[PDB]
Amino acid sequence: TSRGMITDRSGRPLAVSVPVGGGESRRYYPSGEVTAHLIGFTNVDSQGIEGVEKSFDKWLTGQGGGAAHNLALSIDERLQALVYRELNNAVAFNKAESGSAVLVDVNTGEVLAMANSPSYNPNNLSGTPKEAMRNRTITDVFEPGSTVKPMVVMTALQRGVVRENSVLNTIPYRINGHEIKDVARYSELTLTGVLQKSSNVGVSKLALAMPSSALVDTYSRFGLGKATNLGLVGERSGLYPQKQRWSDIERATFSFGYGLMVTPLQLARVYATIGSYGIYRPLSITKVDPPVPGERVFPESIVRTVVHMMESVALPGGGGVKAAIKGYRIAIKTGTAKKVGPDGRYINKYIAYTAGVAPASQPRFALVVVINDPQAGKYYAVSAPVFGAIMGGVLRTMNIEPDALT
Numbered sequence: 534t535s536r537g538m539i540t541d542r543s544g545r546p547l548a549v550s551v552p553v554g555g556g557e558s559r560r561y562y563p564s565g566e567v568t569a570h571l572i573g574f575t576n577v578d579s580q581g582i583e584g585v586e587k588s589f590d591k592w593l594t595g596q597g598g599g600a601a602h603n604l605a606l607s608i609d610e611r612l613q614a615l616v617y618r619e620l621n622n623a624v625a626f627n628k629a630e631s632g633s634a635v636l637v638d639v640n641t642g643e644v645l646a647m648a649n650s651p652s653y654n655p656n657n658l659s660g661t662p663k664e665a666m667r668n669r670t671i672t673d674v675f676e677p678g679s680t681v682k683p684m685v686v687m688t689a690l691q692r693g694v695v696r697e698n699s700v701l702n703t704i705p706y707r708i709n710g711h712e713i714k715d716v717a718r719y720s721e722l723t724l725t726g727v728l729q730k731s732s733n734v735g736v737s738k739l740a741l742a743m744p745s746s747a748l749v750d751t752y753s754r755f756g757l758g759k760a761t762n763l764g765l766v767g768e769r770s771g772l773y774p775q776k777q778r779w780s781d782i783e784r785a786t787f788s789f790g791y792g793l794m795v796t797p798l799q800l801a802r803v804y805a806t807i808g809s810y811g812i813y814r815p816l817s818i819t820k821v822d823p824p825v826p827g828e829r830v831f832p833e834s835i836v837r838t839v840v841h842m843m844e845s846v847a848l849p850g851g852g853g854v855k856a857a858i859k860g861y862r863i864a865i866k867t868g869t870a871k872k873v874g875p876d877g878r879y880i881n882k883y884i885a886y887t888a889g890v891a892p893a894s895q896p897r898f899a900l901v902v903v904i905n906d907p908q909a910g911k912y913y914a915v916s917a918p919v920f921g922a923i924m925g926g927v928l929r930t931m932n933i934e935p936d937a938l939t
Contacts, residue, residue: 679868865889
């Protein structure tokens with residue numbers, strides 16, 4: 534009973550069948566824990582139980598349809614190695630419960646890296662709990678939080694509510710008895726400064742100045758609330774509101790990223806669309822033959838301005854300045870939210886997230902880093918330095934020319 538070999542986009546083996554004894558062979562995974570959640574494993578026989586080993590189980594064995602075939606995943610093992618190395622050490626350094634990282638190609642939609650910490654070893658599953666086996670990038674959902682602020686600015690600019698050079702009044706006001714305030718109370722902020730300071734007061738004025746169906750339509754255009762369609766087991770599509778009646782406070786919280794749950798993979802597809810300047814391309818786990826046309830969902834001119842405004846988050850003044858990369862311009866968005874247990878309420882456990890694209894001149898990659906439950910450490914976010922460390926290694930490995938002056 535033989536089985537085909539799955540490799541990366543360049544041919545590096547990720548799961549092979551090596552002979553143990555006369556004729557009989559055993560499945561070997563040379564990447565080990567670096568790509569355990571995506572590749573998967575097999576039992577005593579040659580059957581797929583998790584990951585790609587199960588999603589492509591018929592293509593690998595090929596029983597009844599020719600000989601066994603090989604599969605080239607869209608993953609780059611060079612990028613997958615550095616993504617897991619920086620993420621697995623960050624979850625341990627911050628004493629986090631778990632951590633997820635998804636790297637997506639902007640121009641093709643191909644998933645270049647997908648890591649989860651903690652992980653298991655598919656070569657010997659002895660002593661590995663099930664809690665550290667599920668692909669948390671597609672099975673876990675969370676509130677995107679401040680990462681949806683760029684799409685709120687895209688809608689206000691497109692709907693003519695606010696111009697690119699408009700100064701908003703960020704005075705802390707109340708919405709029927711709810712203190713909408715920021716940490717640093719600014720009297721007024723420019724439209725670029727709203728994304729720089731992640732001002733909730735600024736984006737709340739934008740959401741209430743347009744119908745509730747505006748942001749509901751904008752998030753859906755970038756992929757929020759839609760299935761990623763990869764074929765992996767447990768691939769969740771998130772929780773998206775399908776209501777028609779909104780309140781004055783639910784429209785504001787919807788602008789803050791709270792009220793909807795999405796997977797780390799869905800959030801990566803959103804910024805992969807932001808990087809493409811408003812082009813929605815489907816995600817893929819295997820190597821794709823270019824070109825991938827996709828579909829435009831937002832005007833290019835509006836997304837271009839917002840991408841340029843997201844660079845202030847990494848520059849001196851923004852909340853993601855700790856994620857900067859030497860000699861590169863990045864358009865990122867970091868923040869920290871609160872976990873939601875099975876009861877549906879907020880528990881005293883936080884979630885740090887950071888999503889962005891690089892380089893800001895013409896982005897080629899989209900990265901999402903989620904650090905779940907950072908017990909030890911400080912937030913003044915824990916996921917910002919991991920973004921610059923992961924993205925920094927990606928830009929250097931792919932030989933991307935520098936963007937900013939050193």
